[PDB]
Amino acid sequence: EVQLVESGAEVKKPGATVKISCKVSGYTFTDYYMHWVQQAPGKGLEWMGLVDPEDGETIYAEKFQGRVTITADTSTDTAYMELSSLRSEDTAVYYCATSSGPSRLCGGGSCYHSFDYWGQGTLVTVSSASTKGPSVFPLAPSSKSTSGGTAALGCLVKDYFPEPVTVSWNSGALTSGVHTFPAVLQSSGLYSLSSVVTVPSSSLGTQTYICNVNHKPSNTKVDKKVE
Amino acid sequence: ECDIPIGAGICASYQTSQSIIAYTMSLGAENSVAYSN
Amino acid sequence: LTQSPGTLSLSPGERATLSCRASQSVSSSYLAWYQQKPGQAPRLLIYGASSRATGIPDRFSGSGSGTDFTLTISRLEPEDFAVYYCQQYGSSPTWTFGQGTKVEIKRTVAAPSVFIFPPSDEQLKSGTASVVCLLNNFYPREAKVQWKVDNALQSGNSQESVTEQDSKDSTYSLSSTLTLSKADYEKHKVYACEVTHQG
Secondary structure (H helix, E strand, O other): OOEEEEOOOEEEOOOOEEEEEEEEEOOOHHHOOEEEEEEOOOOOOEEEEEEOOOOOOEEEOOOOEOOEEEEEEOOOOEEEEEEEOOOHHHOEEEEEEEOOOOOOOOOOOOOOOOOOEEOOOEEEEEOOOOOEOOEEEEEOOOOOOOOHHHHHOEEEEEEEEOOOEEEEEOOOOEOOOEEEEEEEEOOOOOEEEEEEEOOOOOOOOOOOEEEEEEEOOOOEEEEEEEO | OOOEEEEOOEEEEEEOOOEEEEEEOOOOOOOOOOOOO | OEEEOOEOOOOOOOEEEEEEEOOOOOOOOOOEEEEEOOOOOOEEEEEOOOEEOOOOOOOEEEEEEOOEEEEEEEOOOHHHOOEEEEEEEOOOOOEEEOOOEEOOOOOOOEOOEEEEEOOOHHHHHOOEEEEEEEEEEEEOOOOEEEEEOOOOOOOOOOEEEOOOEEOOOOOEEEEEEEEEEHHHHHHOOOOEEEEEOOO
16 A cells, blocks of 8 residues: 655765665655664664655754765655765665654554654665675585585585675576575675585485576676585 | 452452462461371 | 563463563653564554554554553464564654564474585685585574584684574574685694584
8 A cells, every 4th residue: 555665775885975765655745754764684773864755854863963864855756865974884774664644544543653664675785895706616514525415515605796696406496405594794895605405316306416606796607516 | 478459368469571460369378287196 | 772582482372572661761652563574674563552553463462651561472473483673752853663572482492413514626726715514403593613623723713603594494504614725724634513502
């Protein structure tokens, strides 16, 4: 019913400035506050500020004031947030949200402000790095690969930037026992991750294993064989 | 132990998320005294 | 805001209570509560310190007084396994959120199966090493991991151990990676990993 529709994700150097957007649909935009909320990966929610689209008045958390600024446009049905003097700590989600129901349409009547509807949460990534494709290396347990050891074969995917890496196994035909561990940002400024096939070479589908890795930003493709 | 008395052996208290509970009051811990001749 | 316990991990089907607490910086009606699954936008559960939003199950219940407030979940479901946030109005200027209590509700109890991986020919010919130790099929995420050669290498500034992944196997999993020079694979005659779990 109510729709908040943000910008796509952004990638920046420290010291830069970025602008984020949030289109409104399904409701009369003029009547509502629009709010902006941060979330760093695995941390809590954090309110940054709000705008009244009916005249452009605005309020901020004093923690983000002067770095952040917020603006609105009733011709494009859209709110916008600018974050300036960026840092690595700004590597986070930035949602738009109503805390607003002039009528709490499809949700209630009274609003109590209370953060009723949310946009999809635009990512901003801040690093000293620049666009680069992954290395991929094979993994088999113990000193050389072994018969029982076929049960845990994998890859390490190393030093790519920005996101996303995408991974599949045996040209996308193997999904039984496939597993992936969370990606981590290395001290290099670039991401890394690992993945495994948790099943031994007892079948024609497991006699050999392939880490098929594709990094979208580079257009890099790799079909790494594990033995 | 009886906290707030309701009557007919019922008492009530604020206790464990804490809520008002209502219970038959306990007169004391039981004790079988170790008597022999 | 204070929110407690920092994770709430009781069995499904029970009654379980989250708490949200504050200084006198905030006002008594304007508490609210939210659900977030991994990577999702938050969903408004409770407002008015006690009212459910429309389309939220009657088994959720908010209550409180002064600056001590609560959300009781009842008849718990696996769909509740998420981070849960309270929030409250800072009387007039500002919006303040709670900790994000992870509803890590009881799945299984298990110690880790473990696999250990030395460096490999492509990695070494690329001028690098990274030793890998993998843990899976465990609950809770009570895990501790240590690297050895075969004495100790856990002091290495290049060691890493990523956050845990939950699974359809009703259990957590995790990985440690010990990135190194190829000259460390030339130096050390053996590599090993040791694990502590359930306490």
